[PDB]
């Protein structure tokens, strides 16, 4: 698995609130969180599917 698969949910400096998903290594699966709306990191997906296709083990 990559390193980015373990990044924290970085909302960004934007004060907006947008439901996004991320691989959460601290749970071991793809989960939802609130994201800001700028400076999206690698640890940021549009669905659990897409997260899985990207980083879902193998």
List beta partners, residue 24. 29
Please report, for the chain, the start and end positions of each structural domain, with discontinuous segments joined by +.
1-58
Q: Is 26 exposed, middle or buried (0-12, 13-18, 19+ CB in 10 A)?
A: exposed
Q: Hey, what's the torsion of the CAs at 16, 19, 22, 27, to 10 degrees?
A: 110
What fold, for 1-58? Factor Xa Inhibitor (4.10.410)
Experimental determination technique: NMR
Closest CA to 33 of 7, 1, 3: 7
Distance CA 11, CA 2 (A): 21
DSSP 8-state assignment for residue 39: S
Distance CA 21, CA 30 (A): 7
Distance CA 55, CA 53 (A): 6
């Amino acid at each position: 698995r990559p390193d980015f698969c373990l990044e924290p949910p970085y909302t960004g400096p934007c004060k907006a609130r947008i439901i996004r998903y991320f691989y959460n290594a601290k749970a071991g699966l793809c989960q939802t969180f609130v994201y800001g709306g700028c400076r999206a990191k690698r640890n940021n997906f549009k669905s659990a599917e897409d997260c899985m296709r990207t980083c879902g083990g193998a």
